[PDB]
Design goal:
Chain B: It catalyses: a ubiquinone + NADH + 5 H(+)(in) = a ubiquinol + NAD(+) + 4 H(+)(out). Chain B: Its EC number is 7.1.1.2. Chain B: Keywords: 2Fe-2S, Iron, Iron-sulfur, Metal-binding, NAD, Translocase, Ubiquinone. Chain B: This is NADH dehydrogenase [ubiquinone] flavoprotein 2, mitochondrial. The structure is cut from a larger assembly and holds chains A (about 40 residues), B (about 220 residues), C (about 60 residues), D (about 230 residues), E (about 425 residues) and F (about 60 residues). By secondary structure, chain A is mostly helical. Chain A has one helix and no strands. Chain C contains one helix and two strands; from the N terminus they run αββ. Chain C has about 60 residues and is mainly β. Helices cover about 10% and strands about 25% of the residues of chain C. Chain C has one helix at about 25, and strands at about 35-40, 45-50. Chain C starts with about 20 loop residues before the first helix and ends in a 7-residue tail after the last strand. A two-stranded antiparallel sheet of chain C has the order 1-2. Chain D has about 230 residues and is an alpha+beta fold. Chains in contact: A-B, A-E, A-F, B-D, B-E, B-F, C-D, D-E, D-F, E-F. The interface between A and E is medium-sized, with 20 and 29 residues. The complex binds 1,4-dihydronicotinamide adenine dinucleotide, flavin mononucleotide, iron/sulfur cluster (4 copies), FE2/S2 (inorganic) cluster (2 copies) and magnesium ion. Flavin mononucleotide binds near residues 63 and 180 of chain E.
Chain lengths: ~40, ~220, ~60, ~230, ~425, ~60
């Protein structure tokens, strides 16, 4: 119960884990808002 | 004390605008995702992630990588230069395969942080900021890493190692030398920062859902 | 402390100490000093003209 | 109308909404000390030389960026504002180089004049000063970087007026430097104006170097004929 | 009514998985009570959540200790035309503070649910979590927890049987303590240098991307879901008045068992150290000084920490301030001036350089303290240094100048004889 | 050196108002050109306009 440590999986995280998870997550996001132009410098 | 790193760039055969750099198609997909998170008006926000991704593809940031990031995000190159020279996790100079950062701030320094630094120096035979000749290890002294409870600690390539003794850091170093990857986390088997022999809190099993909910909800 | 004839000095290396700041010209109560300056061939800040009228000087 | 009443040294003035404390002081006839604020540039607030005391408020406000509120009584000659000015001037002069005799901006220095009128008359800095390497941005603007006080007027003018994003700040804290980070000439038809807006001798005129002192010059108002703008 | 604080029951804590022994994952979180009646909380309204937070007496856990209900109500103005955002601050910059890290690595789902609840309360369209650049494994755990919540429909499209759309994005910093400050946080999110902006405008008016934004600490965000479920009154009772709730305390330095533990608010400092830290090394008689709220707070000697509580008001009356509830202890076998000089040196390397007071004065302070460590200075300089600190403090854009000046003030105030003795010894040994 | 021949090369007079100067010039018999005083017009300054949501004013750096 209490004795075992359950956070080990992070022992097998690669260099691209964060960005791969973000890529998977991108399909679940609502459409982003728009300010009207492409950039403030436009 | 003093910084020791220059904030002006001079063209070098291994660091110049004609140095070859580009993004892998998977990295391009990652860049598209990163840009997508922000609103369609301010794509300038992606500069810190994408630059980091460039480093994760190269290990350091040449001027060509900064220029490529500026070209992709359509921001002036000078802004990318400011971002690269501002944040300290960006390597504008080549770095070793294993980047060792040893925190020496007061909470870690109190629990005898200098012994670990000197042990690493003696093991590698290099000074505080130098790099080993075979381009394998790099030693850096940094500010607090948010692991004060686990001090003394050092961080290597996204991995935290806490509660180090001199001996422990020697085993970490030569295990990195051997080829395998050491397991991150604190030493002495204290399992992420509870009291070593106390266990004074969170003993009884945790309560079930809706245990303390108020009436009318 | 005696004030006599004017002189321009130089450093032990042999380069003149004057940097054409024109403070002596500004403070001169009799307007006895005239100074013109330009960057030297090595980029040093040196005078091209430093005249003092001994007959307008009040010493 | 929509004018609100504010008091500068106990004197009532009617101002538009959004008017800054600095402009409220201007309307009555006082000029607040400044190094980074410019009318034609965007507000920065970096220098902290405009810090003034608002009565019945424990903390001094930046007059160049803080909009005035109705019923506020500014205290421009209060002891707190004078102490703040002296402290900021001390911090500004702590690392500044003893270059006044060789600096082309001797009698035209805002740093010098504001030290004379708002700072102290002596230093208590017992350390060694810093030195940064100079930059080359072409044949028109001579750059002596150690003199620079990090006001950022040049960056704002280049980005907003000249439309050129070549200038920026690199590094962090004390070692932060204003420049281009690469050998690159900032050349534009409006490039010379950064000499005027720079309060110090960090940016000077290269063809004009070492030739004259400001108190000697006779000023003649005239018209340009190099184009039809006049 | 209660007079003694510091005996908090095991079942009565909020972070029941602080030590990461239970399965943090979504299954484990549900087992521990997480994501329970979220729809009921969403459907009950934002005004109800704001009122519960107000009556809860909750104050910012980041350091300032500002009433969080007041800020979240500052967001409660009607729509303007711009999207509204909730930015969670996970920078975790302050030395000696590890609380944010533990409650992100071993308990992400409470953070995610608190993000959703706070976004509903403030009408935010999405949540941006600025995780520290060094916390990579913590960021990956938070990302996989967010993915699990998206899979279960807990956030995102309609987020519940509610009709409220909410996104949670995670952005990573790059080695910058100044980025913890809320306006510098916003600037770093927008791709510029982590330089703070001036106030006004406040983030509720012009924040991230120019949109109204509310910035909250990770600890502050986590408590809201639990607070709503158990009610404002339950949270309010703990601690003293205007200091209600439970706090995470990180005890480190010269203690036998340095640890992070959640406990009641107005616990005595000595009682907390003895109960959870295992006592100070060498016995309580060996203690020399304590920094209660991280480096940005003045130290206090033994005579003050003997009978001092742990909350905003009592620690302010001790001329320290609670800060980030980060206890760093120092016994009588350590060089205290060296520790304070190391803190000032850290502040010298962590200033953004935007304004002249912080930049120049903090570099000057670092040099002066480096001279003080060896005793190379003179006694008349000590007061000078004090004056320097006064000049820097309250004249800067942000509070990093305060966090650099306050340690110097505390060290001078409580150990001037030590500095004079070191100076005299240097004069003797050098003649 | 720089030689001159007019006695009035260094003569500059100061007046409180334009009318006083005009009166002095008229009573002393000098033909004059008067130039109206230039005043910097009031300007609308806003710090928050730097951090604009959709407008061009937003600054790339600060
Ligand atoms: N948790 C950590 O890692 C660190 C914490 N800190 C702590 O941060 C504290 C100082 O932070 P600050 O934000 O500068 O203090 P602050 O009191 O000025 O502001 C803190 C919060 O209160 C809000 N606020 C304050 N006055 C307001 C007003 N008139 N209207 C609307 N909102 C208002 C602000 O929007 C902000 O969110 C320090 O005490 C320090 O201990 C410092 C470094 C690191
Ligand atoms: C230099 C500096 C660094 C800071 N770093 C942090 C940080 O890492 N985390 C944090 O929550 N607050 C930090 N703060 C204070 C923030 O203002 C705070 O996070 C924000 O106001 C939210 O506070 P709340 O969670 O109490 O509402 C910092 C403040 C300063 C001046
Ligand atoms: S110009 Fe006059 S005051 Fe200046 S350096 Fe030369 S001699 Fe000295
Ligand atoms: S810029 Fe001004 S203060 Fe600095 S050296 Fe030149 S004249 Fe002196
Ligand atoms: S060069 Fe001049 S204008 Fe530019 S930042 Fe420095 S002092 Fe300001
Ligand atoms: S006080 Fe320091 S960190 Fe804060 S804005 Fe000024 S220079 Fe930057
Ligand atoms: S002081 Fe070393 S990790 Fe915090
Ligand atoms: S003039 Fe206001 S801060 Fe510089
Ligand atoms: Mg100039």
């Amino acid at each position: 119960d209490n004795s075992t440590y359950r956070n080990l999986q992070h022992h097998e995280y690669s260099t691209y884990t964060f960005l791969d998870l973000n890529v998977e997550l991108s399909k679940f996001r609502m459409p982003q808002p728009s300010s009207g132009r492409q950039s403030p410098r436009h | 004390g003093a910084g020791g790193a220059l904030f002006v760039h001079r063209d070098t055969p291994e660091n110049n605008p004609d140095t070859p750099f580009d993004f892998t198609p998977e990295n391009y997909k990652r860049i598209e995702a990163i840009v997508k998170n922000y609103p369609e008006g301010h794509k300038a926000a992606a500069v810190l992630p994408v630059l980091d991704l460039a480093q994760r593809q190269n290990g350091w940031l040449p001027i060509s990588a900064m220029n490529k990031v500026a070209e992709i995000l359509q921001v002036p190159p000078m802004r990318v230069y400011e971002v690269a020279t501002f944040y300290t996790m960006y390597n504008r100079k080549p770095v070793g395969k294993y980047h060792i950062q040893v925190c020496t701030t007061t909470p870690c320094m109190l629990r005898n942080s200098d012994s670990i630094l000197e042990a690493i120096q003696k093991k590698l035979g290099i000074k505080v900021g130098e790099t080993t000749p075979d381009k394998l290890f790099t030693l850096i002294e940094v500010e607090c890493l948010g692991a004060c409870v686990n001090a003394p600690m050092v961080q290597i390539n996204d991995n935290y190692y806490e509660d180090l003794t001199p001996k422990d850091i020697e085993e970490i170093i030569d295990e990195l030398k051997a080829g395998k990857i050491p397991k991150p986390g604190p030493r002495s088997g204290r399992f992420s920062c509870e009291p070593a022999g106390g266990l004074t809190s969170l003993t009884e099993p945790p309560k079930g859902p809706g245990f303390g909910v108020q009436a009318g909800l | 402390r005696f004030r006599g004839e004017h002189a321009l000095r130089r450093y032990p290396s042999g380069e003149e100490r004057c940097i054409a700041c024109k403070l002596c010209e500004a403070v001169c109560p009799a307007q006895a000093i005239t100074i013109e300056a330009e960057p030297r061939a090595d980029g040093s800040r040196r005078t091209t003209r430093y005249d003092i009228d001994m007959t307008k000087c009040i010493y | 109308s929509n004018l609100i009443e504010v008091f500068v040294d106990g004197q009532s003035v009617m101002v538009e909404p959004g008017t800054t404390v600095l402009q409220a002081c201007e309307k009555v006839g006082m000029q607040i000390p400044r190094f980074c604020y410019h009318e034609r540039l965007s507000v920065a607030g970096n220098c902290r030389m405009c810090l003034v005391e608002i009565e019945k408020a424990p903390k001094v406000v930046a007059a160049c960026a803080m909009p005035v509120m109705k019923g506020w009584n500014i205290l421009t000659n209060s002891e707190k504002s004078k102490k703040a000015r002296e402290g900021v001037m001390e911090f500004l002069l702590a690392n500044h180089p003893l270059d006044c005799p060789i600096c082309d901006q001797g009698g035209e220095c805002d740093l010098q004049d504001q030290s004379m009128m708002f700072g102290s008359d002596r230093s208590r800095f017992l350390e060694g000063k810093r030195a940064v390497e100079d930059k080359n941005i072409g044949p028109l603007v001579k750059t002596i970087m150690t003199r620079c006080i990090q006001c950022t007027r040049c960056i704002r003018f280049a980005s907003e007026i000249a439309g050129v994003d070549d200038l920026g700040t690199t590094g962090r804290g004390n070692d932060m430097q204003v420049g281009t980070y690469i050998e690159k000439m900032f050349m534009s038809e409006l490039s010379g104006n950064i000499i005027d807006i720079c309060p110090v001798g960090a940016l000077t005129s290269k063809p004009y170097a070492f030739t004259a002192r400001p108190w000697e010059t006779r000023k003649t108002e005239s018209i340009d004929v190099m184009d039809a703008v006049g | 009514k209660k007079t003694s604080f510091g005996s908090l029951k095991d079942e009565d804590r909020i972070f029941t998985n602080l030590y990461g022994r239970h399965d943090w994952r979504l299954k484990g979180a549900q087992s521990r009570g997480d994501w329970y009646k979220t729809k009921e909380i969403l459907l009950k309204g934002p005004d109800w959540i704001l009122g519960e937070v107000k009556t809860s007496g909750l104050r910012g856990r980041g350091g300032a200790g500002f009433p969080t209900g007041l800020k979240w109500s500052f967001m409660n103005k009607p729509s303007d035309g711009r999207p509204k955002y909730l930015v969670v601050n996970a920078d975790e910059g302050e030395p000696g503070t590890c609380k944010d890290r533990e409650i992100i690595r071993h308990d992400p789902h409470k953070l995610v649910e608190g993000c959703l609840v706070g976004g509903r309360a403030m009408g935010a369209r999405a949540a941006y979590i600025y995780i520290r650049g060094e916390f990579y494994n913590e960021a990956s755990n938070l990302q996989v927890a967010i993915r699990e919540a998206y899979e279960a429909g807990l956030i995102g499209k309609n987020a519940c049987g509610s009709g409220y759309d909410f996104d949670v994005f995670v952005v990573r910093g790059a080695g910058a303590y100044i980025c913890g400050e809320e306006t510098a946080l916003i600037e770093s999110i927008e791709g510029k240098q982590g330089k703070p902006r001036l106030k006004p405008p406040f983030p509720a008016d012009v924040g991230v991307f120019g949109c109204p934004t509310t910035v909250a600490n990770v600890e502050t965000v986590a408590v809201s879901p639990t607070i709503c479920r158990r009610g404002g009154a339950w949270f309010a009772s703990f601690g003293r008045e205007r200091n209600s709730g439970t706090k995470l305390f990180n005890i480190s330095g010269h203690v036998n068992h340095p640890c992070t533990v959640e406990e009641e608010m107005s616990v005595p400092l000595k009682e907390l150290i003895e109960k959870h830290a295992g006592g100070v090394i060498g016995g309580w008689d060996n203690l020399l000084a304590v920094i209660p709220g991280g480096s940005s707070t003045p130290l206090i000697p033994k005579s003050v920490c003997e009978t001092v509580l742990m909350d905003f008001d009592a620690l302010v009356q001790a001329q320290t301030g609670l800060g980030t509830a980060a206890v760093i202890v120092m016994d009588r076998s350590t060089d205290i001036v060296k520790a304070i000089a190391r803190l000032i040196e850290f502040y010298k390397h962590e200033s953004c350089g935007q304004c002249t007071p912080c930049r120049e004065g903090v570099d000057w302070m670092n040099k002066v303290m480096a001279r003080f460590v060896k005793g190379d200075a003179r006694p008349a300089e000590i007061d000078s240094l004090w004056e320097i600190s006064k000049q820097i403090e309250g004249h800067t854009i942000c509070a990093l100048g305060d966090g650099a000046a306050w340690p110097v003030q505390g060290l001078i105030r409580h150990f001037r004889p030590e500095l004079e003795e070191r100076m005299q010894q240097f004069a003797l040994q050098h003649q | 050196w720089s030689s001159t021949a007019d006695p009035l090369s260094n003569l500059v007079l100061t007046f409180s108002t334009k009318e006083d100067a005009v009166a002095f010039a008229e009573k002393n018999g000098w033909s004059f050109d008067v130039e109206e005083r230039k005043v910097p017009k009031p300007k609308s300054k806003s710090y928050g306009a730097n951090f604009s949501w959709n407008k061009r004013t937003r600054v790339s750096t600060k």
